[PDB]
Design a protein around this ligand. Sequence first.
Ligand SMILES: [Fe+3]
Ligand SMILES: [Zn+2]
Length: 254
Amino acid sequence: MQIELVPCLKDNYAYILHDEDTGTVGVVDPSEAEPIIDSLKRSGRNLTYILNTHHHYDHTGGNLELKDRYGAKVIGSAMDKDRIPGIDMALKDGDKWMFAGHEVHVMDTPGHTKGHISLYFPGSRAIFTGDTMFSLSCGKLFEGTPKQMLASLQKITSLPDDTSIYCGHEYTLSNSKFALSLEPNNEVLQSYAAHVAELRSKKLPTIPTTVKMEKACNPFLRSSNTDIRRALRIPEAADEAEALGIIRKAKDDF
Ligand SMILES: [Fe+3]
Ligand SMILES: [Zn+2]
């Protein structure tokens, strides 16, 4: 499966999924129809499926136009069925869904919203995490709790280290500045953050990231780290969920 990043809006990523044997095409999180249409006209293909990670307008804004234009089918969360525009098929946690005969494993990943899902394509060693996990951050907790976010992040990080993570936004550079404020002695983070700065200086994406990288660098996955806790005066006795909630509030106000 070829995964094409499609920049939308200011910093969103939609993903056009191209099956190689069939020419079936899907799109993950079409923020707006036009950039998707533009890409499809180039490849000279029709859109089969629209998949949404969560309900926010920046992930669902293009749904109705694309559905009407192409006769595409919208695939989204059963929890969010009344909030996903145009939804044809509603999927539950642990559901398997076939994208032209490639397995998609649906994971409920509440935290940013209640209803957010992530989409794991084991055959492509790829997961679409929406706004649950970014490179070096997690979504703001608009509907869910720190405990829910932690659990969701741990589901993602339980996948193989070589799993590529395709997330909803290009936030990595700003995220890296906050991460370095907390864990400046993390050399893997130092190196990554520099590479990110280089990519962004030439207007290239920092996505996909990987499970391995995020475990090594993302503060939200590293909340028991002594330096991070000391930087934020998080008590040694706090559990990981409490620590995450403190990190998230600090980042919001950074
Ligand atoms: Fe978003
Ligand atoms: Zn969102």
